[PDB]
């Protein structure tokens, strides 16, 4: 009697997320002109003139990996 | 009696998420204008100008994989 | 009477996550102009004018490896 | 047996290429404004506002005289 | 047996290239103005405002005189 | 037997290459104005305001005379 | 040929005012208000301009009389 | 040839005023508003102006009689 | 051949004023005001300019009359 127990494991489990790799080459400009003589912001308002923005949230890409190798006689 | 326990796993599980590899080249530009007397934000309000926005959220994207090898003889 | 029991492990679990590998080439520019008599901005209000910004949050991508081995004669 | 071998060249060869003899009087005594505002360009520019330019390239204008006088007696 | 060889050049072979012997008189004597604002670019820019330039290249204008003058008697 | 071996050769290969025997009275007696204000360049510039430029590159011009006056006796 | 030319206008003409009195006069406008809004202005050549002007005026000549002469002659 | 000219205008004209009294003038206009709003002015070749200006003018010459004479001769 | 030009204009001419007085004259204009706003101004080759001016003038001259003369001879 004999028992050869070996399983072999080259696996990969992988998460790439977000922004990866991207070229952002030159942007944004011409001009912006913003003009008035009363400007007027009063609860929660979100203003963004002639900006760039870059904004990434991962509350995700978590990994799992389980394995439960057992031998009885 | 022999046995032989050899299973082999070179398998890739692969999660890939949001913004990847993507080329923005000169992004934007020309002439943007917003001319008044009065401009009234109040209440909630979100506005954009001549800006450039970007944004990924990945709340997925998650992985996972779960193996089980029990051998009883 | 005899038992081998030699498992083989070369896996990896890895999380690229984030902002990874991007290239942001001169970014910006232009002119932009935000001309009033009066500016009043008085409750939650957020306000970006002509800046840049690069922002990441990751409060996911974490990994979790697990293997119970047991062997019983 | 007399032999008078005596050829004469008088000859000139010439070349002239290029901007040669020419005659520019008072050019460019004009007014020229440019009052641009506000704008985006791009890509590349190129750009000449109220200027002279004389250019001359000349990669020709090459010359060759070639001529043999063989002379075999018997 | 008498042999008398005299040949003669008085040749003149001649390469004249590029800008010559012009005359440029008060070029330029104009009034230029630029008024450029708010502007953006986003590749190479090549301007010349009011500028005179003058530009010969001669990568030519090469010159050869070959000559043989050989006499075999016998 | 007599030989008489008198070649004459009085020629001239002659070059005249770039710029030569130009005149340039007065240039560039204008008024040149550049009122800029509020540019954004992102990339290479190259410019020139109200300058005088002359430029001459000769890579040829090159002259070369060969000859050969053997005379072969028997 | 010979060219002649007498050029001899004569003038004795007379403008002539008479007045008694000139008063009780009121010149009592409301306030005048004006606003004006043009972005960019430019100007060639010759250009004469008034822009967003208020002009209140009270004239009141004891004569205001005007004899006006223009004498031109032009000879090639 | 021979070319003459006389020119010999002849001017006895008289501008004349009388009058028995200015007086008892009231100019009380109300208070005048200008506003101008631009962003650019630019002027060239000859240009003459006048932006947002309020004038108040009290005028009352005891005469204010005027008499104007251009004379011109040109020749070529 | 032989030019003769004979300029000889002639003037006896008078303007006159008689006035019996003046008085009470009021200039009483309410309180004026001026805004002008712009960015930017560029002027080069004969511009002349009056901007935002306030002005109240009062002008009583006696006589205040104005005789002009104008003589121009152009030869070529």
């Known amino acids: 009697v004999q028992i050869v127990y070996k ?3 080259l696996s990969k489990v992988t998460s790439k997320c977000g922004s ?3 070229i ?3 942007p944004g400009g011409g001009q912006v002109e ?3 003589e009363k400007l007027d912001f009063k609860d929660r ?3 963004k ?3 760039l923005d870059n904004i990434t949230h991962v ?3 978590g990994n799992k990996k389980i394995e439960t190798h057992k031998l009885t006689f």
Chains 1, 2, 3 share one sequence.
């Open 7 to 9: 399983p072999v494991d």
């Open 20 to 22: 990866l790799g991207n």
């Open 49 to 51: 003139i002639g900006s």
């Open 59 to 61: 509350p995700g890409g």
């Open 45 to 47: 308002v979100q203003s």
């Open 34 to 36: 913003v003009k008035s």
């Open 24 to 26: 952002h080459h030159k």
